[PDB]
């Protein structure tokens, strides 16, 4: 047959790439890691270096404390034995405080208090990671697109476990930390609010989620189809359109009547994805604060 360009046929390796400097503090980059041949069939072989500033070590320290806080609780639920621990891994849960304690931080360790400690640690882990997303871009003089897209995801997370619980006056409304327990919560949330399929925001979220799969399928397939003219080299094709960009546009124009540019498609991309969590977070935020039952709401619209 013809080659498809899904895996590389030959790997080529040179000296490790220490990266661009620009305004980065090089004192905080690690060494280079090993080269992965396995990874090299699909993308780059080079692991590392990585950047570790104050904000990184903080994120990573808190992130680990969150994880271990949960695991201590799981080991506990498992009467401290490793067979029971593995047997019930998916069934253990760290639940939030009972409605009784509302928004108070006075609930005991065994009945809410641990959930809060863990949630505190998760809160700083994420926000600090967010700042690091911004600062890493600034150090290299790039746009803040990544920090802004990440914020969209933080929106839904913040609504789920922080804002909506505050607005309802209890921590009990937040999500528990468990594999099966957080699925139960989700299914339960829907039932209690009159079926989330009547939440219009939920339906838009779905459309952008599906839409994201559609678009990335279109976009990747397109770039692979024109990789024989150097299509993957997107920044230089922005600066200086080549036949790759031309054929990519034309395929789609001839197919469906309109097309993108090489820069433009990435705007379509970032928005399609970002709107998943943007609409989703609004859908959840309004549930129980303003609308008790989406079926009922859907019958009036008011």
């Amino acid at each position: 047959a013809e080659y498809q360009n899904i895996f590389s046929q030959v790997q080529v390796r040179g000296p490790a790439d220490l990266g661009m400097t620009e305004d980065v503090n090089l004192a905080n980059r690690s060494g280079v890691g090993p080269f992965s041949t396995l990874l090299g069939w699909f993308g780059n072989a080079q692991l590392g270096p990585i950047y570790l500033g104050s904000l990184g070590v903080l994120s990573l320290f808190s992130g680990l404390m969150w994880f271990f806080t949960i695991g201590i609780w799981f080991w506990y639920q498992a009467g401290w034995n490793p067979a029971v621990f593995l047997r019930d891994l998916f069934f253990f849960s760290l639940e939030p405080p009972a409605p009784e304690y509302g928004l108070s931080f006075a609930a005991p360790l065994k009945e809410g208090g641990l959930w809060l400690i863990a949630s505190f640690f998760m809160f700083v882990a994420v926000w600090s990671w967010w700042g690091r997303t911004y600062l890493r871009a600034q150090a290299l003089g790039m746009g803040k697109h990544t920090a802004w897209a990440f914020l969209s995801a933080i929106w839904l997370w913040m609504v789920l476990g922080f804002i909506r619980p505050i607005l309802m006056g209890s921590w009990s409304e937040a999500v528990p930390y468990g594999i099966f327990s957080h699925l139960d919560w989700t299914n339960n949330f829907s039932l209690v609010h009159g079926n989330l399929f009547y939440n219009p925001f939920h339906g838009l979220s779905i459309a952008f989620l599906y839409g994201s799969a559609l678009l990335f399928a279109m976009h990747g397939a397109t770039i692979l189809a024109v990789s024989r003219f150097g299509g993957e080299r997107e920044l230089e094709q922005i600066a200086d359109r080549g036949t790759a960009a031309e054929r990519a546009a034309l395929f789609w124009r001839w197919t469906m009547g309109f097309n993108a540019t090489m820069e433009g498609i990435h705007r379509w991309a970032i928005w399609m994805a970002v709107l998943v969590t943007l609409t989703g977070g609004i859908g959840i935020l309004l549930s129980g604060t303003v609308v008790d039952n989406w079926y009922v709401w859907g019958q009036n619209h008011g």
Binding site: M20, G43, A78, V84, M142, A213, R247, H266
Partner: protein, 281 residues
């Protein structure tokens, strides 16, 4: 009607069927034999939905709903009023989707590009056919298919899921969701990265792919690269839909009880099955 750079590409050839008969455009649209086929199947499907709605007694698109035949018909033909229309429409839709794919193949040939797009599209086509053809046939009735209507089709999703408990517990459905979520993560980042380089801080020079790789290595310690991310997106996308089809093909066929109970295989492994304590003992 043409983009400034388009004329050089509008040459004859690349058709699979019909030679030069349908080798032309209408405005921006390539036609081809499969252009004609998709028009024919779409027109016919739309007419038939229209007819369905007169029989239903509503022109309101929020109420129109073409239902499959009742389970009592099994895999037989059914009368038009009671499921036959759904059957003919499904044929037409299948014809229109497959025709759309083959038309993309023609367009690929004329542009001398690869076939990755229609290939990817065939995954969506295959998910559709799982729900309306493969699953129903293995289950022994057209009735197990979803109806064609805006809200009725969500009804179906919901009633179908809840037949098996909370569907979250379908393990293939878990894998599929993972890929869906991950795909959206990856698309956000890809779009963000490229744009953050084309559109750097005000006053600065456009960044380079090296800045892109550096950015990610700084952030998470790895960068898959610019060929790698398009390979990735294609793969996350298609895997999502593959595992979707699979989680449904097995539901009602090999597994027809409550999905939550499936997980008892794990908990009842003899090494730990009777050890007391935990959640499950």
């Amino acid at each position: 009607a043409l983009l400034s750079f388009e004329r050089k590409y509008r040459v004859p050839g690349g058709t699979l069927v019909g030679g030069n008969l349908f080798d032309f455009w209408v405005g921006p649209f390539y036609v081809g034999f499969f252009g004609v086929a998709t028009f024919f199947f779409a027109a016919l499907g739309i007419i038939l939905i229209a007819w369905s709605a007169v029989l239903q007694g509503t022109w309101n698109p929020q109420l129109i709903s073409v239902y499959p035949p009742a389970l009592e018909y099994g895999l037989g033909g059914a009368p038009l009023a009671k499921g036959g229309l759904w059957q003919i429409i499904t044929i037409c839709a299948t014809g229109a989707f497959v025709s759309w794919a083959l038309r993309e193949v023609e367009i690929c040939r004329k542009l001398g590009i690869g076939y990755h797009i229609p290939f990817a599209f065939a995954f969506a086509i295959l998910a559709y056919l799982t729900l309306v053809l493969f699953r129903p046939v293995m289950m022994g009735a057209w009735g197990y298919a979803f109806p064609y209507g805006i809200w009725t089709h969500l009804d179906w999703v919901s009633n179908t899921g809840y037949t098996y408990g909370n569907f979250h517990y379908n393990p293939a459905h878990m894998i599929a969701i993972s890929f869906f979520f991950t795909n959206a993560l990856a698309l956000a980042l890809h779009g963000a990265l490229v744009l953050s380089a084309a559109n750097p801080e005000k006053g600065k020079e456009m960044r380079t792919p090296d800045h892109e790789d550096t950015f990610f290595r700084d952030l998470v310690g790895y960068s898959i690269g610019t060929l790698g991310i398009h390979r990735l997106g294609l793969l996350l996308s298609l895997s999502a839909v593959f595992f979707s089809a699979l989680c449904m093909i097995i539901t009602g066929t090999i597994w027809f009880d409550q999905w939550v109970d499936w997980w008892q295989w794990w908990v009842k492994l003899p090494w730990w099955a009777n050890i007391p304590g935990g959640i499950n003992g």
